[PDB]
Amino acid sequence: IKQGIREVILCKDQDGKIGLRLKSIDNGIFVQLVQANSPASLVGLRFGDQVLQINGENCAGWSSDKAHKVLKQAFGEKITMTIRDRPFERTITMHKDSTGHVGFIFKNGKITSIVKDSSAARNGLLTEHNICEINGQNVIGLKDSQIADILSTSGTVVTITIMPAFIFEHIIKRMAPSIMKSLMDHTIPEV
Numbered sequence: 001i002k003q004g005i006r007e008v009i010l011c012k013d014q015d016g017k018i019g020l021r022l023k024s025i026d027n028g029i030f031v032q033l034v035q036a037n038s039p040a041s042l043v044g045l046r047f048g049d050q051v052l053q054i055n056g057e058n059c060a061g062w063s064s065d066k067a068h069k070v071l072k073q074a075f076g077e078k079i080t081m082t083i084r085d086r087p088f089e090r091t092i093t094m095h096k097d098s099t100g101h102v103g104f105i106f107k108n109g110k111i112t113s114i115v116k117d118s119s120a121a122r123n124g125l126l127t128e129h130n131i132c133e134i135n136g137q138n139v140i141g142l143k144d145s146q147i148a149d150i151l152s153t154s155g156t157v158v159t160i161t162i163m164p165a166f167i168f169e170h171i172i173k174r175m176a177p178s179i180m181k182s183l184m185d186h187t188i189p190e191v
């Protein structure tokens with residue numbers, strides 16, 4: 001998770017879609033959903049990203065409705081956004097044991113216990129954090145079984161992007177889990 005602000009320049013698809021849902025948190029605007037194969041995915045927007053500006057308007061104080069309204073009205077030949085990278089998240093690097101474990105239990109995406117003497121304990125993995133990404137792959141919406149598969153079919157070094165449950169809960173609110181399982185970009189990023 002960069003400590004970095006960055007500009008992205010977007011262009012609507014032939015359907016006038018960018019593939020984004022925004023959500024208002026603590027008088028910021030945060031990315032609730034990046035759609036697979038969208039402009040939003042292509043410029044590299046991620047779950048949990050803060051939108052500081054849209055076309056050089058500050059987003060501070062907007063409803064999620066006003067954020068979505070603004071998007072709709074943009075002469076969207078070209079859309080500029082100032083992004084703060086995933087401010088509510090942190091990345092932890094672990095190494096599997098010979099048993100092939102990093103050493104935690106999760107339920108519905110959320111870490112619930114740390115196993116003693118483990119790489120998770122050594123790196124201070126916290127419980128009551130939801131798992132947002134795994135080796136830069138968004139895994140939000142996926143079943144527990146599929147998350148477990150991605151951890152199985154990884155190298156010895158594992159990278160996990162976590163977010164405090166209470167913050168995760170407040171972001172995803174008013175999004176059908178199915179839509180996030182169905183449409184939340186779970187792809188490895190293009191180059």
Ligand SMILES: Fc1ccccc1CNc1cn[nH]c1
Pocket residue numbers: 108109110130131132139140141142143172177180
């Ligand atoms: F499984 C769920 C149950 C309720 C809301 C969302 C999900 C998606 N799964 C998830 C959560 N954190 N990471 C992955």
